[PDB]
Amino acid sequence: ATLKDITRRLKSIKNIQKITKSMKMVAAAKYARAERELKPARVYGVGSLALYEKADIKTPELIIGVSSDRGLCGAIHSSVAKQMKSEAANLKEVKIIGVGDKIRSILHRTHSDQFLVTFKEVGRRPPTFGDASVIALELLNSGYEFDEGSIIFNRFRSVISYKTEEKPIFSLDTISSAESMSIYDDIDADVLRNYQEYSLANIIYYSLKESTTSEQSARMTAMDNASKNASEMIDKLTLTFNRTRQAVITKELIEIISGAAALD
Amino acid sequence: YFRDNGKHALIIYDDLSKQAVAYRQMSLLLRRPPGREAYPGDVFYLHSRLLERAAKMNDAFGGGSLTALPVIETQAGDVSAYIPTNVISITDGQIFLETELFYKGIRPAINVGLSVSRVGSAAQTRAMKQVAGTMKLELAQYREVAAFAQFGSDLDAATQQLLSRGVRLTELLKQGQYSPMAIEEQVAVIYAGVRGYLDKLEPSKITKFENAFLSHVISQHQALLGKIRTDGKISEESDAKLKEIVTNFLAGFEA
Amino acid sequence: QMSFTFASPTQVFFNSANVRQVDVPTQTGAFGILAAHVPTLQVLRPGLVVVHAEDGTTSKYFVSSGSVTVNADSSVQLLAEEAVTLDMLDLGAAKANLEKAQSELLGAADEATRAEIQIRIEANEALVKAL
Amino acid sequence: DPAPATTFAHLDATTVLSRAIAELGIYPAVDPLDSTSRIMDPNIVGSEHYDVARGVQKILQDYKSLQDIIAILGMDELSEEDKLTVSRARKIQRFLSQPFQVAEVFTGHLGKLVPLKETIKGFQQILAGEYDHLPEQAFYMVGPIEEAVAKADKLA
Amino acid sequence: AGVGKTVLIMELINNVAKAHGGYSVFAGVGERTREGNDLYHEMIESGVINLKDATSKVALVYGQMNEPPGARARVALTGLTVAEYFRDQEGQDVLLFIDNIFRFTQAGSEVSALLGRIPSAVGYQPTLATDMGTMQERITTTKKGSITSVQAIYVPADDLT
């Protein structure tokens, strides 16, 4: 594979490498953005969980996971993909919802059949409450609610870690009506629902953002390794290069000397 | 002869590469051991010996010169080639041209990054120098950040500027075939860009500007142009004058 | 005291701050949130958050919607979809919006249409409250 | 190199010990996509061999294709079935690692020799993914598959 | 260079030469007449070239490209020879500027060509090494001074082994 071939390699590898880094920075920048943006959200979403945090719910019975639209980031997908399915046997009203598609693309195998809806774009457009509401909204209209809903998302923790986290989504007012939850409110299975609602969006937003944050750092990370990887490989080729490089010459010189010791 | 007649001559050797072949051929026919790639040993020496004869003399000779433009033509994606190697060591910088930019339409299409004048400033005008130092710089970083031409949106504005600016400058170094210029004009157009008036403008209009502007200054600021032609530097007066011209012109041009 | 967490997606206005009381426009209507709290859930309407911060000072906002979360805890959580200080809203515009709203209503003729329009009316009007 | 190149013509069984593999530590160090035998045939040595192999040869062949993309990418965002298979291919690789009775001094390891059936069996099993819930290194320097099993326990 | 590589060199030339009473040799190996010309003027300029007293710290030897390679091939040896003079005789701890020895090497290779020799790899002169050994081994510290080399080296094709 002449030097040429090799150059095809090299050339592109530089590019890749370069790209990785470029893209890295790019990613990292986004990642930074997500981080800041995560702040109010943290509060807010932690807020979302308020009630629930102050209140256990149950059902004998919306399993949904949260992923990014795209890969080329960590094992975000893998996790969720995994852990939704990991669940999925246990429960009645088995039905799944996937937000993002790097879960649609892995959890699709038979989730081609067990998804309820699936949502496209997540990252590559930073998440918003606005959005959160959207996906939330139609989600409601559907006779799937809780089989006990759970929400699977990537809880960012640090650039070194995120945890695909999950919470359960009580998508029923009703048992919230029941229980001691009865008097955690002391004010209507109406507004309940309109909180059940709202918190689904809040969390959705939240989740979305965590997910993406986690992702963005993972992509950033991802770009880091790769580009290093790239670097060593270049090096290896470079030997192969010269060597062969000379080899040519050599062979050729050979051919010269020989052909000059053996011309007509 | 010119050189010794104080005079300055320009020889374009277009090209030693083909010569080398011929010579090699000649050598070989001479049944002589040639060298690398079957090419002779002294094809450098020959030429070194030739090329050293292209020079700028002392004053004793009327200071004369023979300015040499040897050509060695890119080896279709290579220049590692022997003769280039040689020549690389010989010439007083080298102008790497790459097609691609040409193909981009970016004409001229130089591989500037590699291009070198091992000289530089003695071969300059302050006018140019005053800006050119900076220009070089602007390109340098720009090249560095051109690295990440893909986007840079997702990164900082400064550098986004540098990219835009850079791209703009590119337009400034662009030139058509049968389109050479003279110096004041050249600096003139650079000034605009270097004063970043055109960042708002897009590359297409740079060119557009430039002509128009050029023809404009030619008209009005012909006054000024006489002076600049004179001045060898850029003059404070001229700067302002230029600027004002430019700003106004610019304003019209963009409008 | 009540630890008031007043936040919107965008920001946290009060964060478990010992605010004495906050008056909110739950969809219940008005409501005077005091230092400790009922376990109660409330829905937010377009009206004002007046955050009687335990210091006399009270900040105003108009909040469109969201939830106040009324804990058994003295922790109160206003999670306003958006609650903004009126500061960033404009009266002139409000009028214009309301006008439109009112204009629109007249052709709002599916219940939903009416309703949304009505949201606008109601809303826009409710901005006028404090604008 | 022309010399071997010629040589091949005369071969009937080619043994390529593969330094790459050797670098993978393995002794056995062969690469059978290289080490081939004219007499390796569905013919001469059964198709089982061939096929079990073809799957292997394949899987490896594919894998061989993969390692390089993976070299950059890892297999991370690259299909799990592949992940499985890759690992399997590798396991199979590992399972091929076989102690040297002679060079127990050299290896430490104590030689293994495996009659055909257990050979077949081995791959067929690994191929069955039956094994795969297991560690790669379990397959390392085994004797028959049992020994891998034994080793699995010994691992986990 | 033009960084003031050469300058740095000049400064160095100065420093040792100064500080130890040492001295320098400039061996313009396959020298670009042009650069040596330029350079010349720089030393003159720098005044390290002393001309009133030619008690510059350096004897300059230039062996330009334009000279026949055969000639060029030797100039280091020459330099060496002088430096031995200076070393032993003049007690000196010479600095040997060899510029660019790679071009020497190159010249050697050319030389080889003409000499019709079977040469080292890539056609490189065979005896590159042997030449080097005796020479490099000539460069040393006696016990009368030292010929210490500063070698400008161009790494051909930036390729090294």
Tab-separated table of C-alpha atoms in Angstrom, chain D residues 26-83:
chain	number	residue	atom	x	y	z
D	26	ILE	CA	-0.766	-15.210	22.020
D	27	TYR	CA	1.174	-18.247	21.637
D	28	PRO	CA	-0.580	-19.732	19.603
D	29	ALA	CA	0.263	-16.652	17.425
D	30	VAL	CA	-1.158	-17.830	14.021
D	31	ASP	CA	-3.463	-15.822	11.828
D	32	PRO	CA	-5.539	-18.258	9.886
D	33	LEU	CA	-7.013	-15.812	7.536
D	34	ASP	CA	-3.478	-15.981	6.407
D	35	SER	CA	-2.647	-19.412	7.562
D	36	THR	CA	-4.673	-21.340	5.217
D	37	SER	CA	-4.320	-24.752	3.842
D	38	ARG	CA	-5.250	-25.802	0.427
D	39	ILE	CA	-6.176	-28.907	2.191
D	40	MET	CA	-8.317	-26.810	4.474
D	41	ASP	CA	-11.491	-27.446	2.564
D	42	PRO	CA	-15.176	-28.343	3.392
D	43	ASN	CA	-13.914	-31.202	1.482
D	44	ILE	CA	-10.824	-32.501	3.108
D	45	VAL	CA	-11.615	-31.388	6.594
D	46	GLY	CA	-15.357	-31.135	6.784
D	47	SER	CA	-17.505	-28.368	6.317
D	48	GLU	CA	-18.183	-28.170	9.927
D	49	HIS	CA	-14.793	-27.182	10.381
D	50	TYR	CA	-15.131	-25.040	7.336
D	51	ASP	CA	-18.375	-23.387	8.292
D	52	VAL	CA	-17.944	-23.126	11.896
D	53	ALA	CA	-14.883	-21.658	10.620
D	54	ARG	CA	-16.681	-19.745	7.898
D	55	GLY	CA	-18.642	-18.057	10.500
D	56	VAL	CA	-15.511	-17.564	12.383
D	57	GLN	CA	-13.512	-16.587	9.387
D	58	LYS	CA	-16.221	-14.419	8.534
D	59	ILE	CA	-16.739	-12.923	11.869
D	60	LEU	CA	-13.139	-12.327	12.194
D	61	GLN	CA	-12.988	-11.131	8.736
D	62	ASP	CA	-15.582	-8.697	9.522
D	63	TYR	CA	-13.987	-7.918	12.732
D	64	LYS	CA	-10.836	-7.357	10.979
D	65	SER	CA	-12.746	-4.909	9.067
D	66	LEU	CA	-13.980	-3.406	12.126
D	67	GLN	CA	-11.033	-2.931	14.295
D	68	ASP	CA	-9.831	0.023	12.451
D	69	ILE	CA	-12.989	2.037	12.456
D	70	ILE	CA	-13.257	0.917	16.057
D	71	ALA	CA	-9.663	1.910	16.369
D	72	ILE	CA	-10.926	5.350	16.194
D	73	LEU	CA	-14.459	4.927	17.324
D	74	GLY	CA	-14.299	2.031	19.618
D	75	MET	CA	-17.343	-0.064	19.052
D	76	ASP	CA	-19.156	2.211	21.232
D	77	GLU	CA	-21.692	3.781	19.025
D	78	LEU	CA	-21.303	0.749	16.787
D	79	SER	CA	-23.877	-2.024	16.997
D	80	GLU	CA	-23.916	-4.364	19.924
D	81	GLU	CA	-24.531	-7.431	17.946
D	82	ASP	CA	-21.354	-6.503	16.472
D	83	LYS	CA	-20.067	-5.927	19.904
